[PDB]
């Protein structure tokens, strides 16, 4: 266990996901030197549930999942447990049980572009909301009215992904966020992941 | 039903600025797809697309008036206001607002169903 | 200029029926859904078609919409003297990003 834990991997990542198709990175045995992150000023959100942020070296963990999208600056609010809106109801969802760290960051000079990046997507419309960790990537057409579809686009009968449309200069609130969940395991069983 | 009304002046000096507000009722701009565009019609001449606002702020222009035209919204009030700079005489037309029931995008596709609702529309005049 | 073209004018008697076409590209009519509009003397606008052939709540079967490939076709039947006023075709333009409204098409009735 002496290797350093490769957080470099997720958060410096050359490519982040829509948050609608989120990666999860699997971290097992590994030193995981929590402190540089909380030390370093470069992320807006360092939000901890069930554990203290200054106590996470002093700790093992049964497994270490990361998860990492790319959002709208307004909506980081919504990865925290027991929200809801469009991201945590479409899109991702943590339990109220959640037990980690949510960390993000602005990508305003990586996910923007002059005359709006719309690479990245969301889930705009979706017949009932998200299980905790689940991933839906379908795209089957929505049925917003009362006409069927047949799966052929038209009014009320919708694509169910958005596109985000980052500009250079919109408001930090509309401004690219990428986002890393760091999901601690609460199992019984021997520990994997442990700080210094 | 749906009821927009534009406002704003209807006589503005060369190279001053045009500010029109839109009022409506019936609808919401916090409803997903939906949008309010903006046109304009001069004397004898064609509908000449604007510009329109999103429900998530996106904002689209004409491009040959992209460097003239601001577009911004405020929910709670069900206004929508468009900015027009440096006003020529050839911008003499009639401005009118309209809803878009469905505007969505992703990435390269669009859905954008049309303008169900218009306005009365205001006529605006350019003259020294 | 416009990149949306139609006919400046078309005529027929009452009751006959005439077609006002819109041709474009696939950057709009070819890839997206084509609406249709009236406009009487003196007044706004009003949508007559969406989505290529669909008629919004009061609008009669007299109107229809067709759409192929990059050119699209409203059909007015049973022609009335109330029905003169100028056809627009309009749509989305994928490479302009912005909406575009063809030039117009008066109708006369002949009567």
């Known amino acids: 266990i002496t290797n350093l834990c490769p957080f470099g991997e997720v958060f410096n990542a050359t490519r982040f996901a829509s948050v609608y198709a989120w990666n999860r990175k699997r971290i097992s045995n590994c030193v995981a030197d929590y402190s540089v992150l909380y030390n370093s000023a470069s992320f807006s959100t360092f939000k901890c549930y069930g554990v203290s942020p200054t106590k996470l070296n002093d700790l093992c963990f049964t497994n270490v999942y990361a998860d990492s999208f790319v959002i709208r600056g307004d909506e980081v609010r919504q990865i925290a447990p027991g929200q809801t809106g469009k991201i945590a109801d479409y899109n991702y969802k943590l339990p109220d049980d959640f037990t980690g760290c949510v960390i993000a960051w602005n990508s305003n000079n990586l996910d923007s572009k002059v005359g709006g990046n719309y690479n990245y997507l969301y889930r705009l419309f979706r017949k009932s909301n998200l299980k905790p960790f689940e991933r839906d990537i379908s795209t089957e057409i929505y049925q917003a009215g009362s006409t069927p579809c047949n799966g052929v686009e038209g009014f009320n009968c919708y694509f169910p992904l958005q596109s985000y449309g980052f500009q250079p200069t919109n408001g930090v609130g509309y401004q690219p966020y990428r986002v890393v969940v760091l999901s601690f395991e609460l199992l019984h069983a021997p520990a994997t992941v442990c700080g210094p | 039903q749906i009821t927009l009304k534009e406002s704003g002046p209807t006589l503005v000096k060369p190279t001053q600025t045009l500010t029109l507000t839109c009022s409506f009722s019936?609808?919401?701009?916090?409803?997903?797809?939906?949008?309010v565009g903006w046109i304009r019609q001069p004397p004898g001449k064609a509908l000449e697309w604007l510009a329109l606002i999103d429900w998530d702020d996106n904002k689209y222009h004409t491009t040959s008036l992209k460097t003239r035209l601001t577009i911004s919204k405020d929910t709670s009030k069900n206004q929508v206001v468009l900015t027009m700079t440096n006003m020529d005489p050839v911008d003499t037309a009639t401005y009118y607002c309209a809803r878009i029931p469905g505007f969505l995008r992703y990435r390269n596709r669009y859905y954008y169903y049309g303008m169900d609702v218009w306005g009365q529309g205001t006529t605006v005049t350019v003259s020294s | 200029e416009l990149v949306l073209t139609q006919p400046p004018s078309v005529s027929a008697a009452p009751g006959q029926k005439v077609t006002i076409s819109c041709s474009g590209s696939?950057?709009?009519?070819?890839?997206?859904?084509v609406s249709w509009y009236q406009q009487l003397p003196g007044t706004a606008p009003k949508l007559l078609i969406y989505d290529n052939n669909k008629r919004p709540s009061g609008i009669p079967d007299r109107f229809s919409g067709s759409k192929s490939g990059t050119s699209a076709t409203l059909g007015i039947t049973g022609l009335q003297t109330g029905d003169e006023a100028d056809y627009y075709c309009?749509?989305?333009?994928?490479?302009?990003?912005?909406?575009?409204f063809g030039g117009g098409t008066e109708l006369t009735v002949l009567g």
């Open positions: 309009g749509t989305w333009d994928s490479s302009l990003s912005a909406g575009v």
């Open positions: 019936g609808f919401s701009l916090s409803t997903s797809g939906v949008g």
């Open positions: 696939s950057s709009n009519i070819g890839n997206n859904y």
